[PDB]
């Protein structure tokens, strides 16, 4: 009497990518405004120069009024604007 | 280059003023 055992535990893999590269501009939730704030607050003054510059390009009122003290208002800022802050800070934190 | 500012929280966690600081 000899013995052999057999079994095939076949589990499916998963790989998914977005088809487009469009400005999704989804309704940015309250917490994602905070998520930018903490992660931008840890960026050096050099990066803070570009961080505000894109906001001042969106808000020409604050651009012209104050080139010295700049208040980034995330809550009213457009999800298309904050898209740049998100992808940029993420590119500073991660090698991406 | 410039006088080094700091990013500071303006009341709300959704507002940050980069105040005019000396390096």
Q: Which of A31, A58, A63, A50 is nearest to A89 (CA)?
A: A50
Q: Which of B4, B15, B19 sits opposite A73 (nearest CB)?
A: B15
Architecture of domain A30-93: Up-down Bundle (1.20)
Q: What is the DSSP letter of A72?
A: E
Method by which this entry was solved: NMR
Element (H, E) at A64: helix A60-65
Q: Do A69 and B17 touch (CB under 8 A)?
A: yes
User: What is the secondary structure of A3-53 as a DSSP string?
Assistant: --------PPP-----S----------HHHHHHHHHHHHTS-HHHHHHHHH
> Measured between alpha carbons, how far is residue B7 from residues A4, A12, A38, A71 in Å?
69, 48, 10, 9
Q: Which of A37, A52, A68 sits opposite B20 (nearest CB)?
A: A68
Rg (CA), chain B: 10
């Amino acid at each position: 009497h000899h013995h052999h055992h057999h079994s095939h535990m076949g589990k499916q893999a998963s790989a998914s990518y977005d088809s487009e590269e469009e400005e999704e501009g989804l309704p940015m939730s309250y917490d994602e405004k905070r998520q930018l704030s903490l992660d931008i607050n840890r960026l050096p003054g050099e990066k803070l120069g570009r961080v505000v510059h894109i906001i001042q390009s969106r808000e020409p009122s604050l651009r012209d009024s104050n080139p010295d003290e700049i208040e980034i208002d995330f809550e009213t800022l457009k999800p298309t604007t904050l898209r740049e802050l998100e992808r940029y800070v993420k590119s500073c934190l991660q090698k991406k | 280059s410039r006088l080094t500012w700091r990013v500071q929280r303006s009341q709300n966690p959704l507002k940050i003023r980069l105040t005019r600081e000396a390096p």
